[PDB]
Design a protein around this ligand. Structure first.
Ligand code: ZN
Ligand code: ZN
Lengths: 9, 388, 144
């Protein structure tokens, strides 16, 4: 299920 | 003019929701864990409605006359019915995959998701609080007071006119497009909540509609009615073109954006920018080499120029651009004949659906029989009948 | 009206052949200009310009398709008027998409079989005269 990651490096 | 609400109506509606819930538990659809999460939303809005009914135990008149709660309940039954017609309309194509029917079930699901957000927003813990609802961005917060005071909800026409004063709305189709963007619940009404969301999404208020035309109407990057899983699925076809991205409304963080990009190592990620307008995020990401191909496209629109005092001139947007944009959302509830009003009548001997307005408009011009199958009319009927 | 704007993107998107280059300023939407290219019978390229005219009460009254750039064919008139069923009252249903009419106009130019134009002094030549008809139709498209 889903997954929001941190903003791109 | 939506009518008074009372327990019998709420329970009427609860039966139609259960019908919808039964339609979606069909395994051929496996919606148990699909992003908007409908089998969780209906039970959830139902269970919250009971809370509202409890807090107003003994004050059911007050509740029943609440304009927002009335408009809400009307729309909830309207939407649970569109759903039911949807499954009946498209038949087995519903269990297809990537089909229009199923595509629309998701659009609808997304609406139910927003509806429940607005409901919990206005009736926190069950008690109505719309008249003290806190608009996030102070500038917009002003516009609302100075225009609707403590009103929790206003008709589209009232909102559109009020807005035009401060943000000139170029023309006919622009207003329609602007509407399918702000009317999350799709009920021709704009709530203080629906407004707070939109004003956050397209901040800063100082350039509200400039932002909205540059980020959503024209930008090939923006995707309407997309869920976390559909983005992942869409970016799949660009998994070998790192830099490809698309953005959309975050579903679990309303009023915030969710950008989905393909990485160097060929993976699809999604993020919700923190404390910053979508365009600063998109400019920076571009500069930093992360967002380069909006929806795969090679030219990446320049958004610099949504910056500093008296920020540039207004981009031109064709009537075609606005039309293509409007065709992005809803539409399935729309009448094929006029493509603008909701279908609300089912011609009977045959069975065609259509907006009453057209049916009436055709007969007045003396059009033989049904507009679709020029067959004799006999009687009309609700697209979806009340629970028996 | 918003049905026109939908009808428009309907054909524009589906870049059908036989019908290329579509015109109309989006400040009117009532008048449509397009270009057609036949196939089977003689007819070929040149200046095959058409103009669809949607009455104020579209889609409750059908649109009128009239040629602005000459041609032969039995039923088609010299003033420009044409005459197919799908777009004629008594037979018209507001549901039909303009799209499918500019295709029921193909089964008119290509592999025809008219009933009777608005001049028997043009119609009667097909029933018996394959020479000057099929000729001034495969030559006429070229000389104009
Ligand atoms: Zn209609
Ligand atoms: Zn019918």
């Amino acid at each position: 299920s889903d997954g929001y990651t941190p903003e791109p490096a | 003019p939506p009518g008074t609400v009372d327990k019998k109506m709420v329970e009427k509606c609860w039966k139609l929701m259960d019908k919808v819930v039964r339609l979606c538990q069909n395994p051929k659809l496996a919606l148990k864990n699909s992003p908007p999460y409908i089998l969780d939303l209906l039970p959830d809005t139902y269970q919250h409605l009971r809370t509202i009914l409890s807090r107003y135990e003994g004050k059911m008149e007050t509740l029943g006359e609440n304009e927002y709660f009335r408009v809400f309940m009307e729309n909830l039954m309207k939407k649970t019915k569109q759903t039911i017609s949807l499954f009946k309309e498209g038949k087995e194509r519903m269990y297809e995959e990537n089909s229009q029917p199923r595509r629309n079930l998701t659009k609808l699901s997304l609406i139910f998701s927003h509806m429940l957000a607005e409901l919990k927003g206005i009736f926190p813990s069950g008690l109505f609080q719309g008249d003290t609802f806190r608009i996030t961005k102070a500038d917009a917060a002003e516009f609302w007071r100075k225009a609707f005071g403590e009103k929790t909800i206003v008709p589209w026409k009232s909102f559109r006119q009020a807005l035009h004063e401060v943000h000139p709305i170029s023309s006919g189709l622009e207003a329609m497009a602007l509407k399918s963007t702000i009317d999350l619940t799709c009920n021709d009404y704009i709530s203080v909540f629906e407004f707070d969301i939109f004003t956050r999404l397209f901040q800063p208020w100082s350039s509200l509609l400039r932002n909205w035309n540059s980020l959503a109407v024209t930008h090939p990057g923006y995707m309407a009615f997309l869920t976390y899983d559909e983005v992942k699925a869409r970016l799949q076809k660009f998994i070998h073109k790192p830099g490809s991205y698309i953005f959309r409304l975050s579903c679990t963080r309303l009023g915030q954006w969710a950008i989905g990009y393909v990485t160097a190592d060929g993976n699809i990620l999604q993020t919700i920018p923190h404390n910053k307008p979508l365009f600063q995020a998109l400019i920076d990401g571009f500069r930093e080499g992360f967002y380069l191909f909006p929806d795969g496209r090679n030219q990446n629109p320049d958004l610099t120029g949504l910056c500093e005092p008296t920020p540039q001139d207004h981009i031109k947007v064709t009537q075609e651009q606005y039309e293509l944009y409007c065709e992005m959302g809803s539409t399935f509830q729309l009448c094929k004949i006029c493509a603008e009003n909701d279908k609300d009548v089912k011609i009977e001997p045959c069975g065609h659906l259509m907006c009453t307005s057209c049916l009436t408009s055709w007969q007045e011009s003396e059009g033989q029989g049904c507009p679709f199958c020029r067959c004799e009319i006999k009687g009309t009927e609700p697209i979806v009948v009340d629970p028996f | 009206s918003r049905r026109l704007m939908k009808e428009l993107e309907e054909i524009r998107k589906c870049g059908m052949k036989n019908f290329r280059n579509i015109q109309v300023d989006e400040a009117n939407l009532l008048t449509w200009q397009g270009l057609i290219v036949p196939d089977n019978p003689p007819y070929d390229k040149g200046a095959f310009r058409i103009e669809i005219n949607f009455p104020a009460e579209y889609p409750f009254k059908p649109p009128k398709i009239t040629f602005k750039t000459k041609i032969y064919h039995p039923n088609i008139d010299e003033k420009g008027q044409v005459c197919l069923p799908v777009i004629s009252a008594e037979n018209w249903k507001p549901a039909t998409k303009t799209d499918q009419v500019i295709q029921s106009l193909i089964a008119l130019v290509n592999d025809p079989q008219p009933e009777h134009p608005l001049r028997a002094d043009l119609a009667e030549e097909y029933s018996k005269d394959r020479k000057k008809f099929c000729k001034n139709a495969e030559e006429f498209t070229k000389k104009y």
